[PDB]
């Protein structure tokens, strides 16, 4: 298993759900790799001073560097995670639909289609909500994983 964190610029909220999701793997002892990209991120896009701020006090330390999600990853990956349907059909038009393996963020926990708060540009307070409602889902997404690490 090995997880792909997606949305348009990578550092809106991947790598949060990133490091999030490797401490909640490392409580429940799953067995992992969890990564992040986006669709227009560049290699020298960086976790903004507010999302490794929220995980600072989380007491998990971000430190991401973005890169743009390309075939290579997608194919190394055995889960693609995207924040929105505008963004699995984006990978779908760089992939050549190689779509089945994307799930929206919401969708992969509860069946439909949704996104977490998009805290991008906000202050740490919005960071601090996102972080909050970004834990539940993943504890949820643990519980969804430990059914067959998928």
Not at 102 to 108: A, S
Not at 127 to 130: D, G, I, L, R, V
């Given at each position: 298993m090995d997880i792909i964190f997606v949305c348009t610029?990578?550092?809106?909220?991947?790598?949060?759900?990133?490091?999030?999701?490797?401490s909640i793997a490392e409580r429940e002892g799953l067995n992992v790799n969890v990564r992040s990209a986006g669709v227009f991120a560049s290699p020298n896009g960086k976790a903004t001073p507010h999302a490794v701020e929220?995980?600072?006090e989380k007491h998990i330390a971000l430190?991401?560097?973005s890169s743009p999600l390309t075939?290579?990853?997608?194919?190394?990956?055995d889960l693609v995670l995207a924040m929105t349907h505008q963004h699995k059909q984006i990978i779908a038009s760089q992939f050549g639909r190689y779509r089945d393996k994307?799930?929206?963020?919401?969708?992969?926990?509860?069946?439909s289609h949704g996104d977490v708060l998009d805290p991008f540009g906000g202050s740490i307070d919005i960071?601090?909500?996102?972080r909050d409602e970004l834990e539940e889902l993943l504890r949820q997404l643990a519980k969804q994983l430990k059914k067959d690490r998928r």
């Open positions: 610029g990578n550092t809106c909220r991947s790598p949060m759900a990133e490091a999030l999701f490797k929220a995980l600072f430190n991401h560097v075939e290579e990853l997608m194919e190394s990956a994307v799930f929206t963020l919401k969708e992969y926990v509860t069946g960071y601090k909500q996102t």
